[PDB]
Coordinates of C-alpha atoms in Angstrom, one line a residue:
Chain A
X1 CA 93.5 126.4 102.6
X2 CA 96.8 124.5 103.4
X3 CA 98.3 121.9 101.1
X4 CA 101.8 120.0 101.5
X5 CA 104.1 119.9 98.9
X6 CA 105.2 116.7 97.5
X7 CA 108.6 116.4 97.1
X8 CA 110.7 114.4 94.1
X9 CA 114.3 114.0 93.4
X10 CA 115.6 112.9 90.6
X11 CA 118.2 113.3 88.1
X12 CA 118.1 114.0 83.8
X13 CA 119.7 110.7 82.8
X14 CA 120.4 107.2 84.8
X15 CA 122.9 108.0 87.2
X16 CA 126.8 107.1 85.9
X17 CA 129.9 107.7 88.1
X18 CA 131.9 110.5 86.8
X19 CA 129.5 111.3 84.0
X20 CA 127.8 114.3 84.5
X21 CA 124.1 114.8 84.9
X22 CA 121.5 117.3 86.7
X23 CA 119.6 116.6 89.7
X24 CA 116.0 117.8 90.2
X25 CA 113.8 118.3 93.1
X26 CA 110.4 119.4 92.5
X27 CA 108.2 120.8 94.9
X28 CA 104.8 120.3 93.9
X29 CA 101.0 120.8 94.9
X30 CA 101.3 122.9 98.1
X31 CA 99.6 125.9 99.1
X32 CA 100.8 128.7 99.8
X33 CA 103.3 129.7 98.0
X34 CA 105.9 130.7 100.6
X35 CA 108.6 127.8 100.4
X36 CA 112.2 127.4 101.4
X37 CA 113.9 124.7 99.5
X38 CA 117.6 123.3 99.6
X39 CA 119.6 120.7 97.7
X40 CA 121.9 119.3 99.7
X41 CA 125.6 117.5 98.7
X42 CA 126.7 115.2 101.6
X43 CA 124.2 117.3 104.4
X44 CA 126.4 120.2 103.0
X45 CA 124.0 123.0 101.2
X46 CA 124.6 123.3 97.3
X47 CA 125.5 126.5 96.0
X48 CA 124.8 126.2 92.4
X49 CA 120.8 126.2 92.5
X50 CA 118.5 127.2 89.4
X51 CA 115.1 127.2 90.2
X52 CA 112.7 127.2 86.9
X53 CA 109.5 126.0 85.9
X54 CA 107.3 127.9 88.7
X55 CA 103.4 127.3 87.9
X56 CA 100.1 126.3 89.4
X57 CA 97.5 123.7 88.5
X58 CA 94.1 124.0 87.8
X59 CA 93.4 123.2 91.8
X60 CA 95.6 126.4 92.2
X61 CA 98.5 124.7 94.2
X62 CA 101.8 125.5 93.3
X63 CA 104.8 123.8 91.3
X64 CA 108.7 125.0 91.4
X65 CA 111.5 122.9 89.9
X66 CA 115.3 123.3 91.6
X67 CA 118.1 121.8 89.5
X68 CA 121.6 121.5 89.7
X69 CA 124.6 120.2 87.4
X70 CA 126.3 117.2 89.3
X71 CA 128.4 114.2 88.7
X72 CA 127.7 111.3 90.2
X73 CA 130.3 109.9 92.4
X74 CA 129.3 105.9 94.7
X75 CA 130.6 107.8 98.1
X76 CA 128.3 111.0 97.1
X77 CA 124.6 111.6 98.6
X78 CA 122.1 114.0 97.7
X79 CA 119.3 115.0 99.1
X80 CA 116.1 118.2 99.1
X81 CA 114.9 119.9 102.5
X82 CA 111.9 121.4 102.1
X83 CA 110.1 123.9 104.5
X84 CA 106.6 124.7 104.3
X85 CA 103.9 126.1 106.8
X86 CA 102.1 122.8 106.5
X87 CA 104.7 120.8 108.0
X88 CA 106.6 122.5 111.5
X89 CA 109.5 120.4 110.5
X90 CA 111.3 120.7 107.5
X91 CA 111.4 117.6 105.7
X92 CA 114.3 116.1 104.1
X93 CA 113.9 114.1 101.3
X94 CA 116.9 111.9 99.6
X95 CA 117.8 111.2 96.5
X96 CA 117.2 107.3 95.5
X97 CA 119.7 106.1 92.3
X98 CA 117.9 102.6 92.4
X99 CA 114.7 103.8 91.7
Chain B
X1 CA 104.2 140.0 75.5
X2 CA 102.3 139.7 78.4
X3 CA 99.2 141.9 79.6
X4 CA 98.6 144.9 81.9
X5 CA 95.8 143.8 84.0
X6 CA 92.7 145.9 85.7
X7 CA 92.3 146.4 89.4
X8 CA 90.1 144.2 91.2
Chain C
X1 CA 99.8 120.8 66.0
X2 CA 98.2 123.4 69.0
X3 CA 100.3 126.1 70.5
X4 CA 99.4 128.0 73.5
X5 CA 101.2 131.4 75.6
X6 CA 100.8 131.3 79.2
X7 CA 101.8 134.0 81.9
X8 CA 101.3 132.9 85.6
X9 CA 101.2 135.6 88.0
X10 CA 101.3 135.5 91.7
X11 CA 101.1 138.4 93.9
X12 CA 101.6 137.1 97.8
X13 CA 102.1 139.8 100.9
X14 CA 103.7 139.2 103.7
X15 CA 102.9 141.8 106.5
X16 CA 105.9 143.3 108.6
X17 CA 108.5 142.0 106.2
X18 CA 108.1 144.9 103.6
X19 CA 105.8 145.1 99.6
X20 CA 104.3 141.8 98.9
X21 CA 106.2 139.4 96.2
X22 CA 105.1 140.1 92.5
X23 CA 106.3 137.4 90.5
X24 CA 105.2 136.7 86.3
X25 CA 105.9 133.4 84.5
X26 CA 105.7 132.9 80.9
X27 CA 105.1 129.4 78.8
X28 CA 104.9 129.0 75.1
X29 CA 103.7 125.4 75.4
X30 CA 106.1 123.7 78.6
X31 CA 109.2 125.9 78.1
X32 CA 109.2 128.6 80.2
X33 CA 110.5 131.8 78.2
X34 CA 110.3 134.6 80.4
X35 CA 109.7 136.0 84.3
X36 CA 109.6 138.6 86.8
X37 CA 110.3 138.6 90.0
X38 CA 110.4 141.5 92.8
X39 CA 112.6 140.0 94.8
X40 CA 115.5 140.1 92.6
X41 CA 118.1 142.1 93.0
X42 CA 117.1 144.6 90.3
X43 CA 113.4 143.6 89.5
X44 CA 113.2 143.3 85.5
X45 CA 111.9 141.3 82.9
X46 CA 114.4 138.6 81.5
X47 CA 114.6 135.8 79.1
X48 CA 114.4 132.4 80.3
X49 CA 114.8 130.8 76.7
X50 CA 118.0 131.4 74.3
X51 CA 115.4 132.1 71.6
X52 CA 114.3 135.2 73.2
X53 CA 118.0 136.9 73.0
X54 CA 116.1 137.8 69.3
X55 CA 113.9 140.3 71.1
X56 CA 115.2 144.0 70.9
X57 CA 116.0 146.2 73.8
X58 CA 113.7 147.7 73.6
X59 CA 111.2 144.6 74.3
X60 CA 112.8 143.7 77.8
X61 CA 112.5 148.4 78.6
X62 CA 108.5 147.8 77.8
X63 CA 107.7 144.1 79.4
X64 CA 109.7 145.7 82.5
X65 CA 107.9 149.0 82.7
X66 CA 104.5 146.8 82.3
X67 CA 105.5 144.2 84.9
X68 CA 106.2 147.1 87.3
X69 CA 102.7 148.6 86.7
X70 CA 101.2 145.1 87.2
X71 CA 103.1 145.1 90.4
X72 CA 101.8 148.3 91.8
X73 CA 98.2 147.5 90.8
X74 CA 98.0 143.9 92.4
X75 CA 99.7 145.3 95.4
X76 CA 96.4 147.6 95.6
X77 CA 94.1 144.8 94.9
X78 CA 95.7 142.7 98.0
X79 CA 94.8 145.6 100.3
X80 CA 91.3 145.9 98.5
X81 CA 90.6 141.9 98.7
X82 CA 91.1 142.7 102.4
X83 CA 88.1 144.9 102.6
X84 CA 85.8 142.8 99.7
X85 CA 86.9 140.0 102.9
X86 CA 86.7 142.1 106.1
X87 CA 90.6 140.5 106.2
X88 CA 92.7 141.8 108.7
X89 CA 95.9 143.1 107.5
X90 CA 98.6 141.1 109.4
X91 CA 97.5 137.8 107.6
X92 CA 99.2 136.8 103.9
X93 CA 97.2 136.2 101.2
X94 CA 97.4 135.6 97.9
X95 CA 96.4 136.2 94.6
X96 CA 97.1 133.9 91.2
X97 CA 96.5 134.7 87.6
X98 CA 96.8 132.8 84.5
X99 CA 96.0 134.3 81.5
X100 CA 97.0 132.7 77.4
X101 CA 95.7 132.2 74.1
X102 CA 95.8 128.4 72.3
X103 CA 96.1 128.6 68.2
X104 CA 96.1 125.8 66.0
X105 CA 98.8 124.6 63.7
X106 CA 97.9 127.0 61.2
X107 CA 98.2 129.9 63.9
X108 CA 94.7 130.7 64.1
X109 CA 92.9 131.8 67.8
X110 CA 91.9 128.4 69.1
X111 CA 91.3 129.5 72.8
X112 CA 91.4 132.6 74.9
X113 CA 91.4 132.9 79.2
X114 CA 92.0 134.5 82.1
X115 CA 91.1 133.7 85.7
X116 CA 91.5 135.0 89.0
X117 CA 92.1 133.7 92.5
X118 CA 92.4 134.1 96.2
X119 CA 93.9 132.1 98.6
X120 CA 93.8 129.5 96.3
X121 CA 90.2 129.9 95.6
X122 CA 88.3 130.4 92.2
X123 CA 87.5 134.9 92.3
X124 CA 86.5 135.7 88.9
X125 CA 87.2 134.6 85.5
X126 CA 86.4 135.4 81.6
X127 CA 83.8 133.1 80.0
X128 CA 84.5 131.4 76.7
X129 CA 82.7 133.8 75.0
X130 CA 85.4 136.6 76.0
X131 CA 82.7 139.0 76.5
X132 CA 81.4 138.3 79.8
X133 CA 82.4 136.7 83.2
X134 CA 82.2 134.6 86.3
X135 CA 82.6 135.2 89.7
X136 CA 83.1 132.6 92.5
X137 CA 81.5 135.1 95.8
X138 CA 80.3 138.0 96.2
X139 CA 83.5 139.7 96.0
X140 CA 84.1 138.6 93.0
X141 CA 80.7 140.3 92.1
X142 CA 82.2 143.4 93.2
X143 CA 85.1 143.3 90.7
X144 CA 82.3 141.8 87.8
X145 CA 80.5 145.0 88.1
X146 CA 83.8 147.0 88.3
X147 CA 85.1 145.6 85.1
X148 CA 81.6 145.7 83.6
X149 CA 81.5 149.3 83.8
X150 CA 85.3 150.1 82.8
X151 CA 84.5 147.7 79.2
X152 CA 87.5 146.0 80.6
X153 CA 86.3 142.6 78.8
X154 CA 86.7 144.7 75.4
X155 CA 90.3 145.4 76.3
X156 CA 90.7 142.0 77.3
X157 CA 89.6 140.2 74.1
X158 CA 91.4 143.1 72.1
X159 CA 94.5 141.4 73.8
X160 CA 93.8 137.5 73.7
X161 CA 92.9 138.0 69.9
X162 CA 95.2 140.5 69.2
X163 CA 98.8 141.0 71.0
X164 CA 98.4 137.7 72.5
X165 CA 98.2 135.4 69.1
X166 CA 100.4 137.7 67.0
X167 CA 103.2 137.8 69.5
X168 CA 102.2 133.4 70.0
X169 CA 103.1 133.1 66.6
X170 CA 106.4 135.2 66.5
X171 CA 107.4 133.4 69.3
X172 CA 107.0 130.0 67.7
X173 CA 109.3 131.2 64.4
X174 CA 111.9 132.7 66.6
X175 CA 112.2 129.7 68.6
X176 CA 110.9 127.3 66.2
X177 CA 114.4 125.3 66.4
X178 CA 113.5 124.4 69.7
X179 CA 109.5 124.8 70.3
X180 CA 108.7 122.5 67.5
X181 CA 110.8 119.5 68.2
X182 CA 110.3 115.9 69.2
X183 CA 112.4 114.6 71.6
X184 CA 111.7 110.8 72.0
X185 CA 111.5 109.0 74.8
X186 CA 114.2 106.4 76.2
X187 CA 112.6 104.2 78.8
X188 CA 113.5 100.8 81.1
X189 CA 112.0 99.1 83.6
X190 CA 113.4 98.8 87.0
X191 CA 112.8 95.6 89.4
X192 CA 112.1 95.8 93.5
X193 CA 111.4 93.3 95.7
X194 CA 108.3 93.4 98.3
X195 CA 107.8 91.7 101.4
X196 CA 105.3 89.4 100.1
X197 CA 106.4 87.4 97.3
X198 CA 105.8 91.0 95.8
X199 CA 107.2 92.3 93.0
X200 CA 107.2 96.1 92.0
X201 CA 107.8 97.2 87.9
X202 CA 108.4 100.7 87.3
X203 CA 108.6 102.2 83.8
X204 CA 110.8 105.0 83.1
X205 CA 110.4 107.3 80.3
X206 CA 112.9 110.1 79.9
X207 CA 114.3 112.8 77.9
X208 CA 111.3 113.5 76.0
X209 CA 109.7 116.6 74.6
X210 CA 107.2 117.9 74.1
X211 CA 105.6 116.8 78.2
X212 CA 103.1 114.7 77.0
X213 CA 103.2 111.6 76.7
X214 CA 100.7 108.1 77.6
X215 CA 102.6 105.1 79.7
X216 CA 100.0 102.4 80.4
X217 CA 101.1 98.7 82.4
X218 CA 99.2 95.8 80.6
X219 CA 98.4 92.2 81.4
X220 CA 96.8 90.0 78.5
X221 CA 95.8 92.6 76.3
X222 CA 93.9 94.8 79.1
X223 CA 95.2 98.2 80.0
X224 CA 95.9 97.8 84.2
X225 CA 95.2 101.9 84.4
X226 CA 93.5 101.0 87.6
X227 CA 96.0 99.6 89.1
X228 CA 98.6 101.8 88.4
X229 CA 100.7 104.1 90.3
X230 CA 102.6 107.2 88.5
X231 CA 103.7 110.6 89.2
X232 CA 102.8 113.9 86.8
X233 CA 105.1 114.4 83.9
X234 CA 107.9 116.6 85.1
X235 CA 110.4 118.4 83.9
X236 CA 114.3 117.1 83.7
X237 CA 115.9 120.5 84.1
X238 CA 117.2 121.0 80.5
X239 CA 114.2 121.1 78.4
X240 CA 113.0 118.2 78.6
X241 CA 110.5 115.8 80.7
X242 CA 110.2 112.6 82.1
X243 CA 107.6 110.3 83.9
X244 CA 107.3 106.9 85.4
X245 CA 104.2 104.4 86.3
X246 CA 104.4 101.0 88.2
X247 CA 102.6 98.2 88.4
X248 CA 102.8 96.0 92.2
X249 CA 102.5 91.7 90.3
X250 CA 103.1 88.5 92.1
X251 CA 106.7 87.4 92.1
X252 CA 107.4 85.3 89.1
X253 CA 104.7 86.5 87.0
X254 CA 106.8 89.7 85.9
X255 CA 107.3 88.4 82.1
X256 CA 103.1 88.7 81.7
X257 CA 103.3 92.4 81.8
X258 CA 103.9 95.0 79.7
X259 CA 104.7 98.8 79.7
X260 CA 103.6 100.8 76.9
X261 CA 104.9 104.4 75.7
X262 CA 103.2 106.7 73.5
X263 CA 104.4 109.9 72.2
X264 CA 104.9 111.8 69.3
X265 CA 108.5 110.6 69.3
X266 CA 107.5 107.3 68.8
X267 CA 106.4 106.7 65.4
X268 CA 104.8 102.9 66.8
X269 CA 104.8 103.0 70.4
X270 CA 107.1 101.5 72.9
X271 CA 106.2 98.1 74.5
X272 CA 108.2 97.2 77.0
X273 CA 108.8 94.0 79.9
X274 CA 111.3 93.3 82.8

């Protein structure tokens, strides 16, 4: 069995210029477990990455949370690539402040 | 404490 | 309220690139508290929650030592799944284990489990009873039979009633500070425009603790569950969790709908419109 992950980013509180925060991407429901997983700072890789909270569901698939300490800046982007088996091309997902 | 499991 | 200790194992190989990955994860409720991991750069059991620097030395010395025999033993039961399967052995596979106990408030054994798989299939598991057990194929039968024989389900339920509750319990004094608060949630409702006089609401619930929580859009009284669109709780990084659910209305009808929050942070829950 083969199941993609699903991607979120997002950060711990509403995003504030100059105030710092922590910006999440978790990597959920795929299958299997082999994963490659970069936050990124400007297309630039972050160096400073804690992942945490590594489980599986009842359906088996399997959850990973990466986080990183960050202070929002107006010129700044972040973003998560993702590589999986299930996908050839690693996918790239960006982080939206307006959501 | 976490448990020392059998072989399958 | 109920309290439960979770470990989730994974054992994954990888042919040609060395021992397969042996990896432990432990809960006691959301927070995760402690792990293993073979690929680190000096394989050990650590803490993963400040609570745990109370644990003696000589703790981390035996949950190491265990981890390492756990290690060993699943990286057997890979190569033995492969000829339960008739596998060949250039493939990965994988095998997952989750194993806890649940007590109520008063710390008594509410719950005990453990159950296998492969590949991301259902193998074998412990029945409710925690005397006997269930396999998914025929393989699984094989191990049944095994286990059967070596009164492993005794030495199981020894553990889930035993070690597992006793050390639940110590676990939820030492870290009581921080496993039993209430961190209540801070939500708002964010506005986007759709291309069809379209209007999307999303309600966002954050820094709340424990994970679960209830947010439901409604519209003249009546809960819109079935229209709604959410993601799973999730954690923020730090401890805590947060969660958000939307609701797609007709563009100047936003004021007729409602998001409500529940959660034990909320003495009356949260009812919130654009």
């Amino acid at each position: 069995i083969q199941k993609t992950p699903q991607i979120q980013v997002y950060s711990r509180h509403p995003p504030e210029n100059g105030k710092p925060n922590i910006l999440n991407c978790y990597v959920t429901q795929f299958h299997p477990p082999h994963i490659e997983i970069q936050m990124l700072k400007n297309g630039k890789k972050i160096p400073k990455v804690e992942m945490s909270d590594m489980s599986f569901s009842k359906d088996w698939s399997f959850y990973i949370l990466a986080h990183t300490e960050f202070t929002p800046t107006e010129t700044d982007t972040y973003a998560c690539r993702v590589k999986h088996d299930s996908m050839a091309e690693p996918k790239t997902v960006y982080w939206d402040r307006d959501m | 404490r976490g448990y020392l499991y059998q072989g399958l | 309220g109920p309290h439960s200790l979770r470990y989730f194992v994974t054992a994954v190989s990888r042919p040609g690139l060395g021992e397969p990955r042996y990896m432990e994860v432990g809960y006691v409720d959301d927070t995760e508290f402690v792990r293993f991991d073979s690929d680190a750069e000096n394989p050990r059991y650590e803490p993963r929650a400040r609570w745990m620097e109370q644990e003696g030395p000589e703790y981390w010395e035996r949950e190491t030592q265990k981890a390492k025999g756990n290690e060993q033993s699943f990286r057997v039961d890979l190569r033995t799944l492969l000829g339960y399967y008739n596998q060949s052995k250039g493939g990965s596979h994988t095998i997952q284990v989750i194993s806890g106990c649940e007590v109520g408030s008063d710390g008594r054994l509410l719950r005990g489990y453990q159950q296998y798989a492969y590949d991301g299939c259902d193998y074998i598991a412990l029945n409710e009873d925690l005397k006997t057990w269930t396999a998914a194929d025929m393989a699984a039968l094989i191990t049944k039979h095994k286990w059967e024989q070596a009164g492993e389900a005794e030495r199981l339920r020894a553990y889930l009633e035993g070690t597992c509750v006793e050390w639940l319990r110590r676990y939820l004094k030492n870290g009581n500070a921080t496993l039993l608060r209430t961190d209540s949630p801070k939500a708002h409702v964010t506005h986007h425009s759709r291309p069809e006089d379209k209007v999307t609401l999303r309600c966002w619930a954050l820094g709340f603790y424990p994970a679960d929580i209830t947010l439901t859009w409604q519209l003249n009284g009546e809960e819109l569950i079935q229209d709604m669109e959410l993601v799973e709780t999730r954690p923020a990084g730090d401890g805590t969790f947060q969660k958000w659910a939307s609701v797609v209305v007709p563009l100047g009808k936003e004021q007729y709908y409602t998001c409500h929050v529940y959660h034990q942070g909320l003495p009356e829950p949260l009812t919130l419109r654009w």
